[PDB]
Symmetry: C3
Subunit: 239 residues, 3 copies
């Protein structure tokens, strides 16, 4: 036997969206469940992007954890079960003595499923609205498979060049999209678009996205979960 737990989230469809949003690039993940909260850590199969989803105890209406354990489930089966959650439904994540996860969706009825279980020296920081960065990624995807990110003093540039076409998205603090731009020195880096597209899919104006990067080094993309939780991506630069 492993440690039992009962964890309740209000808004089953919103929770499915976090798990969907955090696991578009991955096939497997580890869930560290402690008294403080849940941590989901994963890497995509090409080991280019590290995912870290932190869900503290405070975002749950009920959080009964009297120990510590690391748990793995089939992520395809999990996403399919969570996709069954409706907008204002209650989500219950229960575990007993056995190696099984019990997932309840409370609404017009209670539907219970059972699943078997198993510091970078950054040069630039940018706080951007989620709709602007999702637009920019999509625009770059039309011309290339790589996207360049440039941070100058009070200016953030996104560019992509292909065999025939080019794209450029420039931003200053004057633009509605740029909330903050802290730059030590001129910073330029290029990243894969397949990875960026899955990180930015489903972002909007309500999303304050922090992007940290350096010269020829990884990008840290971060956005908050109800001002307590956090979804972080650490993305390797392109060769």
């Amino acid at each position: 036997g492993s440690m039992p737990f009962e964890i309740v989230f209000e808004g089953a469809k919103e929770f499915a969206q976090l798990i969907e949003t955090a696991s578009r690039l991955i096939d497997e993940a580890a869930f560290k469940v402690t008294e403080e909260g849940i941590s989901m850590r994963a890497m995509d199969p090409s080991r280019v992007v590290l995912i870290d989803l932190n869900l503290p105890a405070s975002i749950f209406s009920k959080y009964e954890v009297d120990g510590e354990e690391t748990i793995g489930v089939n992520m395809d089966h999990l996403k399919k079960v969570l996709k069954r959650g409706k907008a204002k439904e209650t989500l219950i994540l229960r575990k007993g003595e056995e190696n099984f996860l019990e997932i309840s969706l409370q609404g017009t009825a209670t539907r219970t499923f059972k699943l078997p279980l198993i510091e970078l020296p950054f040069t630039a920081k940018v706080v951007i609205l989620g709709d602007v960065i999702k637009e920019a990624v999509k625009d770059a995807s039309l011309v290339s498979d790589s996207m360049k990110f440039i941070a100058k003093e009070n200016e953030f540039t996104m560019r992509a060049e292909g065999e025939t076409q080019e794209v450029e998205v420039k931003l200053t603090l004057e633009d509605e999209g740029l909330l903050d731009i802290e730059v030590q020195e001129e910073t330029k880096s290029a990243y894969g678009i397949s990875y960026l597209s899955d990180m930015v899919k489903g972002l909007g104006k309500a999303d304050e996205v922090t992007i940290k990067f350096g010269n020829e080094m990884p990008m840290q993309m971060e956005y908050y979960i109800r001002d307590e939780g956090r979804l972080i991506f650490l993305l390797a630069p392109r060769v």
Copy 2:
């Protein structure tokens, strides 16, 4: 020559939805047209489910039938024609002396198409909302190809078990989903999910669904058409 008729239905898109809803499992159907109403009878190609759609004269704004006949049309061509009907349009089903069905859609214009023509001893009864039974069927479809229906005194259970996963949907009269539960004895039966999915597709909260079943015997699923008409499915239990 066969007997002529003119039958008018108000709400062409709603009529297409009845025919779509009743014919998801079938490829051919017989339409018995009498002075009382229209009956559509069919069986799916595997002879596991019997469909019976009864549309009495009273749901039509015009019902001119001066005899009795059984008619068959290509169901694919019929569904495609009915799918052309808009929300508040008038549907006209006319037949003359010839073996042809004339289907008119009255709206921004009149669009006329011409088509060539050719007691179980139940132990349990359950009146359930259409949204709860559609949810339960979909949930079961994630883990298995068969679904078990259990009726106890004041409790209705839906369960499915696969190679790895399990699902359970429990209901009492306390639940908003359970309107009625009349049980003679404890009743358990299992049915194919492919069949159930097509029977419950498009059901919502406005739909009061009567499910009658017995131990190891067929299930009768029934829902009303404007409180006059009726769509009944008789589904064979799984081996």
Copy 3:
């Protein structure tokens, strides 16, 4: 070097819709840019339909053209770039001394893309609402690959016949769909449905569509762009 220009359109998504609507049948097009406006001329690969899109200077918030030139771009890459334009965004079409088109989308940010650049004797006239003609084309597509257009004195008929099925859509000035019907003599002609479907895709009640045709001769289909511009199709009759 070729002549430079700057052309600004208010409503980027609406402009993408004109270019999408005008180029569903074509793969390449020539754009004649003069001081009066832009003309897009094209023919589909089977040379059955001629497209003529006229966009006068007056529909643009800025129209700086100090010469005359005929320009070609990859239409797939153009439609993909224009599809990035949002509802109330500003569209900027700029050209410098070089053989490149600069397309800017002004909104939550400025997103600049760079693209490399390269009298019939009619017998009948019909002014029809765009929703009625799109419905009629779709209805005919269910039974045949050809559609017959008939114009009598105060009556317009659309018919199609297949191997088994038939369709008929009749209209008089009494019908809401028929705004005008000017007929010299009884006019009958048949056209390919694949071509008609792309010409009528996206039309609604707000669209006053003029159809001019003759006996066994082409059809001219025309609709206005903000009461100034014009999209004309000249479609060859079917053999």
